[PDB]
Design a protein around this ligand. Structure first.
Ligand SMILES: Cc1cc2nc3c(=O)[nH]c(=O)nc-3n(C[C@H](O)[C@H](O)[C@H](O)COP(=O)(O)OP(=O)(O)OC[C@H]3O[C@@H](n4cnc5c(N)ncnc54)[C@H](O)[C@@H]3O)c2cc1C
Ligand SMILES: CC(C)=CCC/C(C)=C/CC/C(C)=C/CC/C(C)=C/CC/C(C)=C/CC/C(C)=C/CC/C(C)=C/CC1=C(C)C(=O)c2ccccc2C1=O
Ligand code: SF4
Ligand code: F3S
Ligand code: FES
Lengths: 130, 577, 119, 243
């Protein structure tokens, strides 16, 4: 029989608490919750819209609770965090060679942000100004 | 002892051992090959090489030029039939490595590029960035995974070989994780254990390069050849001894003393060349020996800078710039920052000569075979007669794949035609190993192995360095004899079985002492100066082809003495003078 | 020792959706959260731009129908995908995890589809 | 001068005697140049002869160094005492079984590496024909991903591997990706089954800490995502072959 006794350290459910790098990962996953919450909010707003002016007014009142406002303010902060982190990670999927050298990821990151900035302006213009 | 069956056993999984293993798998697809290594293959010391591997390739080159450089650089102690074989087989093997996936640096057209090493006139050194050994070894290791003929014994420390009636019959090894002994039976055995540079206090070598294989062979009456010729690399970091490649000076780096003076011009390597244009054979790209010796002269004049780790000169690379640095020298910059707190862009790197490569080794013929039938040796651990009295820069990596193949194929043939030996005699030999081990464990006397080690290293550094004298060589010979007595009074306090390195490091030291004595005795008897062996005493300061155009053979008898015989050097087409 | 003949995972399907979802919500979610979540209820918009009438006009328009569909659905497939792995990483054991979250996504997708073709 | 001393906490374990690992403490002299490797040697030489650990190169190129320093996976030869004057705790490489002191069972690592067939496949060329042609551009495709020293720090770093020991892991996937992107290789299909497995690339949730701790800047996280893209293509093609 062997004289070895391999000691296996257990991994707890609090593994992510220890190291700030793991904490920022968990916080990234965290952004999902408001995102889903927002998609839900929109379905309510969609069906309140089809049921007519009465239902829509009750939807708009809900949105100014204003506990909901603070939740949405948080939702916005989460969404912007998701954006910032998403653009840092997507570049890593591309293996693009330019002049005998693997490119990236800054040239891609900047582009994504430029599109976000334009989209925000185009949409805000279309939604409000008219 | 649990007993295993194999057609051939390979001791060591570096460049040479793997190439041998792969070759034997291809020479016989039905073979059962046992590849043994005290570390996982990729930790083997071949991984640390950054210069490159020699192979003729440019149109304007010839195998005669590579043959000539080797023989001349070996100061005519090379076996010329072996050198000829060697040069003619480098292109095949470097190309084959490429076919196995090795990422050799490329020209724009997509052919492999080459550059200059070992003082060569025509550049022929193939290079994988500045990680050539890393790439060669990982390529070789990873390639060997597809051959199920190769059963690896990873982290198994080989203790001794089994010999009977002038024929090798297997070996005994310890399973390092279990702590248990194992017999491996094989009618052919290839020693590929690397050199013995860890017998020196300061060196470029990995901790595992302890001379085990050379020691085991000594035990069975096989002589070690040309052991006095030890190679110092001229630019290593102080304290650690870590190699700063020749590439630094290839890319136009300079070497200066406390006065910022490029001293090399005064030692026959003049005149000074401009910062942009380094020229081969001149200044910082002069002859290795002349450069390592120049340091010594500068140390005598009090021109070396003083540091806590030791006296040094400065390797200045500021005038290179980023593009050149980070394209061809990035790893050097990490090494410098980490191990001596120096940024090469903003500062000069401290350096001094450092023990590097073991030219000597286990005596072999032109097929890598020893005087014991079926027992082969290959790579730095061997002496095939390629390197003579000084190895050529970048011929070591090529040797691994050129002769690794040969040994792999050759060993396959001996196995096939071996025939059975005496079963009882062999098992008796195995019992002999197990018993000799128990004697070492039950040994006592309260001597600390580490201190014997420390002192061995200091003795080799003082006695068998760049410049040698009969006073100090004798001092080292006597010092080793002392330490051999002390070794018998060492006590190994860790009696554990699970990865017990206390025992293993102590065994290594044992081999080292035996090899060290061969180095010192060989040097003392060689009354001439040739290649890496340089003496200052009257009538020994010059080459002597009348009396010393011959190899040193160091035997070690059962009485523990180190005796010397001499043998002749095979000439073909290039006599000396 | 290691499985020589492993089953291909169906993850690429969900990952693809997760990928489109994350990219959409990265670019377009912030402005939409700002509009619906903040500007609208606080009444920080000029004239009748976000009044019941103009929203309905947009919603009912074909582009709006497709836009509102993707705006709702794509983030769900990204978000529920992330929650599925938050459970695993927190070691919270969810029975039939695969089916629950992606089923919820399927369900909601359908409900949203009904919405954008009106009820 | 006088060398400053540092108290170092090494987590010992001897399976013959100990029921669980336990900390020990050693005062070690140091200066600005002193590495954790240096210190481990000093301890064995002078304080505890039974301290077992892996190492060889001394210059961060072999990869045998691997171990945890203050919950961060590092190489002992590239870890320096000057940076830990507030305390230093040294454990065996994380997410691998502890055999003895700082030596862990690396078997799963090696087996994962072997599984993905890390060698050129389906190239009939022989050496008498000379080397393949490969441009800098073509080499730039896989080159960074060929720099792996197999130290296993990325395995200690990955919590997914911690949570799932069957995950073939960052370095293993990276090597598969390295050959898959080599213009000389024609065995991509021979490696996908593993990559496409749930224990393949799809165990990765892109925590990204493997790239963080990688001493040779291989960026295995990037190799995995590229692997996920390639696995997805392979999934699509597989769906469209009614053959
Ligand atoms: C820093 C550095 C840079 C270099 N650069 C270059 C270069 O650019 N070009 C060049 O040509 N040469 C170079 N060299 C020289 C050359 O790389 C080496 O001489 C060569 O790689 C040694 O290979 P090997 O297979 O003979 O032995 P190694 O690569 O040392 O392998 C020996 C093997 O034997 C095993 N082993 C040893 N003892 C035992 C035992 N008792 N039981 C079981 N296994 C054992 C080890 O585990 C190991 O796997 C360099 C050397 C150094 C130190
Ligand atoms: C579209 C292309 C795309 C998705 C690019 C970004 C890649 C990213 C952000 C990956 C991060 C990522 C996360 C965060 C997962 O949880 C996860 C879980 C299971 C499989 C894969 C993944 C994964 O790739
Ligand atoms: S990837 Fe970086 S870290 Fe993971 S093994 Fe290869 S080198 Fe060590
Ligand atoms: S640490 Fe782990 S999960 Fe993915 S990106 Fe790196 S492997
Ligand atoms: S000892 Fe070789 S990697 Fe640290």
């Amino acid at each position: 029989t062997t004289k070895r006794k391999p000691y296996v350290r257990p991994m707890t459910s609090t593994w992510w608490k220890k190291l700030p790098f793991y904490r920022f990962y968990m916080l990234r996953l965290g952004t999902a919750v408001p995102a889903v919450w927002f998609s839900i909010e929109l379905i309510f707003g969609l069906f309140a819209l089809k049921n007519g002016p009465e239902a829509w007014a009750g939807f708009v009142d809900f949105l100014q609770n204003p506990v909901i406002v603070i939740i949405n303010l948080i939702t916005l902060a989460a969404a912007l965090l998701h954006t910032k982190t998403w653009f840092e990670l997507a570049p890593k999927a591309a293996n693009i060679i330019v002049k005998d050298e693997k490119m990236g990821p800054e040239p891609i990151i900047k582009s994504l942000w430029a599109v976000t900035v334009v989209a925000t302006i185009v949409i805000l213009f279309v939604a409000l100004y008219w | 002892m649990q007993t295993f069956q194999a057609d051939l056993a390979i001791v060591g999984a570096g460049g040479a051992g793997l190439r041998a293993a792969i070759a034997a798998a291809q020479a016989n697809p039905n073979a059962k090959i046992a590849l043994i290594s005290k570390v996982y293959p990729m930790r083997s010391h071949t991984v640390a090489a950054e210069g490159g591997s020699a192979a003729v390739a440019q149109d304007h080159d010839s195998f005669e030029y590579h043959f000539h450089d080797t023989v001349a650089g070996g100061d005519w102690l090379c076996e010329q039939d072996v050198v000829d074989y060697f040069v003619h087989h480098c292109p095949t093997e470097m190309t084959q490595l490429e076919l196995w996936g090795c990422p050799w640096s490329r020209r724009p057209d997509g052919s492999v590029n080459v550059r200059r090493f070992g003082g060569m006139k025509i550049e022929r050194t193939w290079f994988a960035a500045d990680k050539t050994g890393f790439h060669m070894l990982h390529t070789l290791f990873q390639t060997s995974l597809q051959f199920p003929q190769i059963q690896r014994f990873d982290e198994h420390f080989v203790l001794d070989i089994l010999v009977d009636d002038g024929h090798v019959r297997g070996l005994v090894a310890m399973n390092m994780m279990e702590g248990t002994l194992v017999q491996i039976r094989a009618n052919a055995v290839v020693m590929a254990t690397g050199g013995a540079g860890r017998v020196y206090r300061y060196n470029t070598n990995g901790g595992i390069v302890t001379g085990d294989g050379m020691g085991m062979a000594l035990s069975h009456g096989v002589p070690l050849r040309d052991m006095e010729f030890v190679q110092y690399h001229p630019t290593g970091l102080p304290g650690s001894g870590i190699l700063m490649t020749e590439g630094c000076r290839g890319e136009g780096g300079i070497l200066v003393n406390k006065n910022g003076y490029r001293y090399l011009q005064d030692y026959g390597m003049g005149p000074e060349t401009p910062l942009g244009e380094p020229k081969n054979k001149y200044m910082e790209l002069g002859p290795r020996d002349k450069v390592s010796q120049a340091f010594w002269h500068e140390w005598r004049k009090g021109n070396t800078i003083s540091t806590p780790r030791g006296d040094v000169v400065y390797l200045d690379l500021r005038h290179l710039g980023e593009k050149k640095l980070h394209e061809r020298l990035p790893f050097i910059c990490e090494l410098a920052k980490a191990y001596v707190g120096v940024d090469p862009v903003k500062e000069p790197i401290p350096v001094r000569p450092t023990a590097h490569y073991t030219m000597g080794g286990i005596e072999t013929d032109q097929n890598c075979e020893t005087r014991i039938k079926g027992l082969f040796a290959v790579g730095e651990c061997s002496s095939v007669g390629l390197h003579g009295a000084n190895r050529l820069g970048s011929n070591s990596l090529a040797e691994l794949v050129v002769f690794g193949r040969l040994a792999g194929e050759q060993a396959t043939e001996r196995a096939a035609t071996a025939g059975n030996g005496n079963e009882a005699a062999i098992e008796a030999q195995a019992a002999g190993v197990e018993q000799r081990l128990k004697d070492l464990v039950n040994q006592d006397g309260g001597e600390n192995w580490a201190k014997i080690r420390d002192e061995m290293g200091l003795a080799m550094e003082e006695g068998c360095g760049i410049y040698r004298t009969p006073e100090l060589m004798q001092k080292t010979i006597d010092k080793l004899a002392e330490l051999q007595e002390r070794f018998k009074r060492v006590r190994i306090t860790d009696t554990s079985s699970v990865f017990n390195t206390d025992l293993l490091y102590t065994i290594e030291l044992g081999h080292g002492l035996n090899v060290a004595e061969c180095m010192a005795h060989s040097a003392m008897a060689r009354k001439e100066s040739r290649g890496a062996h340089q003496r200052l005493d009257e009538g020994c300061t010059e080459r002597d082809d009348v009396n010393f155009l011959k190899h040193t053979l160091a035997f070690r008898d059962a009485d523990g003495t180190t005796r010397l015989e001499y043998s002749d050097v095979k000439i073909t087409t290039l006599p000396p003078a | 020792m290691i499985n020589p003949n492993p089953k291909r995972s169906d993850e690429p399907v969900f990952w693809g959706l997760f990928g489109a979802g994350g990219m959409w919500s990265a670019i377009i979610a912030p402005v939409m959260i700002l509009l619906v979540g903040i500007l609208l209820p606080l009444g920080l918009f000029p004239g009748d731009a976000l009044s019941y009438e103009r929203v309905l006009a947009f919603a009912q328009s074909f582009i709006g129908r497709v836009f509102l569909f993707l705006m709702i659905v794509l983030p769900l497939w990204c978000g529920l995908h992330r929650m599925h792995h938050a459970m695993h990483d927190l070691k919270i054991h969810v029975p039939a995890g695969k089916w629950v979250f992606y089923g919820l996504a399927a369900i909601l997708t359908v409900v949203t589809l009904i919405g954008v073709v009106t009820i | 001068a006088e060398m400053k001393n540092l108290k170092i906490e090494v987590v010992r374990y001897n399976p013959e005697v100990d029921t669980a690992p336990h900390s020990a403490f050693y005062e070690v002299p140091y200066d600005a140049t002193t590495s954790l490797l240096d210190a481990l040697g000093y301890i064995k030489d002078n304080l505890a002869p039974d301290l077992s650990y892996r190492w060889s190169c001394r210059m961060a190129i072999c990869g045998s160094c691997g171990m945890m320093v203050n919950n961060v996976p590092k190489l002992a030869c590239k870890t320096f005492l000057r940076d830990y004057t507030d305390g230093m705790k040294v454990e065996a490489l994380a997410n691998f079984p502890i055999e003895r002191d700082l030596v862990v069972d690396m078997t799963h690592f090696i087996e994962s590496l072997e599984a993905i067939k890390p060698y050129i496949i389906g190239n009939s060329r022989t050496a008498d024909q000379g080397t393949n042609i490969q441009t800098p551009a073509q080499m730039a495709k896989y080159h960074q991903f060929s720099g792996c020293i197999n130290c296993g720090l990325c395995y200690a770093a990955c919590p997914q591997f911690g949570l799932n020991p069957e995950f073939i892991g960052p370095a293993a996937i990276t090597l598969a990706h390295r050959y898959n992107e080599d213009s000389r290789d024609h065995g991509k299909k021979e490696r996908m089954a593993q990559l496409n497995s749930q224990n393949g690339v799809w165990s990765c949730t892109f925590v990204g800490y493997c790239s963080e701790v990688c001493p040779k800047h291989v960026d295995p996280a990037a190799a995995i995502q590229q692997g996920k893209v390639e696995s997805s293509k392979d999934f699509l093609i597989a769906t469209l072959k009614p053959r």
